Design a protein around this ligand. Structure first.
Ligand SMILES: [Mn+2]
Ligand SMILES: [Mn+2]
Ligand SMILES: [Mn+2]
Lengths: 225, 214
């Protein structure tokens, strides 16, 4: 079970709701599962002060938050204000819609350089930055993945939220990929199929992750299709 | 091993809140099971199977158990619910002395025997009024002991502790007679010593941790 692993501390991906009453049930589940940290999605749906009061009550910490690229492009100052309203989360690029995906190696380089500029401004405001990949960043140009192109061009203020299932599915070894990102990994992300309860060669991946500097194993439960 | 699976007790729809939003929250929290409360079996089987969530318990009021039990059996089997749970007693239905709590346990034990012959199990969910004591014994122990082991406890540990009884120790008196632990979601993170409650619950044979939305 991924939740019973103890190489990396566990964090849960949590979808925020407008109703702070129903948000409390999600936090009570984490308390009983022994999970103390969350990565938030849609955090702006709820009032910051209401969410802060509930997190404090349940001793849960927001360790990162999904911020779409159009918000980083359109008003970064507002992103900074919104994220700091709840504390100190890593600002994480969650996904790229098809229309935002570069087409060639030079485009992926330019995109990483763009993100590196945001990472500098976020850093000046006291916020870190991460990038969460899926499958389209695994495309390769002359032997190098789009993901490595953009992270290398962005510089070490941008860390990887590495989705290792997509790394492996593309035919790259996840542990070796983590070696190339030594000191530039924020977390490992994985889908969790195990039912909630009280409390891919993971046996090599999680040690490689920890040696690279990963701080969190972020687990996600999905809606069925 | 040392984990209790978590189920959620469903709640009524207030404001705009839909039922499917309830199930979607549970999917995203990873909760695989629900305890239902008081819409047709056709409608709720369909939504539960589409969200891949099973019913593990259903709150059935005492007046239904007393009035039409064969109908209770039919309705529970229609949604695949395996456990009939008495959720509450209104003040007028609460026995007044030790003899009355014993007689009430015997009554419930008769329903548990009939439910068992129909292939269904039975549990009893307490609040605070069952924690009253007669010559050292709680009303809750009187009724469970008198009902026999076909009636199990859905033990509300907050009300046990609030009455001055250690919930871990109380679970020890109910070894093999505990269906679930019950708790609400509005409690601050550490009143209740979950470091002792959870192993006691597991040792006693609890099958579920059931979370109630205040
Ligand atoms: Mn992410
Ligand atoms: Mn490189
Ligand atoms: Mn209860």
């Amino acid at each position: 079970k991924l939740d019973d692993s103890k190489t990396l501390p566990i964090a849960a991906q949590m979808y925020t709701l407008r109703n702070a009453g129903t948000l409390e049930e999600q936090l009570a589940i984490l308390n009983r599962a022994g999970v103390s940290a969350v990565e938030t999605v849609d955090m702006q749906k709820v009032s910051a002060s209401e969410l802060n009061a509930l997190l404090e009550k349940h001793k849960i910490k927001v360790i990162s938050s999904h911020v779409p690229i159009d918000k980083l492009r359109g008003n970064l100052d507002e992103v900074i204000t919104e994220q700091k309203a709840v504390g100190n989360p890593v600002v994480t690029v969650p996904f790229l819609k098809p229309e935002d995906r570069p087409k060639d190696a030079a485009g992926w380089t330019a995109f990483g350089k763009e993100l590196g500029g945001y990472a500098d401004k976020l850093s000046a405001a006291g916020l870190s930055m991460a990038y969460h990949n899926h499958d389209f960043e695994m495309v390769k140009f002359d032997g190098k993945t789009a993901l490595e192109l953009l992270l290398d061009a962005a510089g070490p203020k941008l860390q990887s939220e590495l989705d290792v299932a997509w790394v492996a599915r593309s035919g790259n070894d996840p542990a070796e990929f983590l070696g190339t990102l030594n000191g530039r990994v924020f977390a490992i992300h994985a889908k969790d199929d195990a039912p909630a309860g009280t409390a891919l060669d993971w046996k090599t991946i999680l040690p490689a992750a920890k040696h690279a500097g990963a701080q969190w194993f972020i687990l996600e439960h999905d809606l069925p299709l």
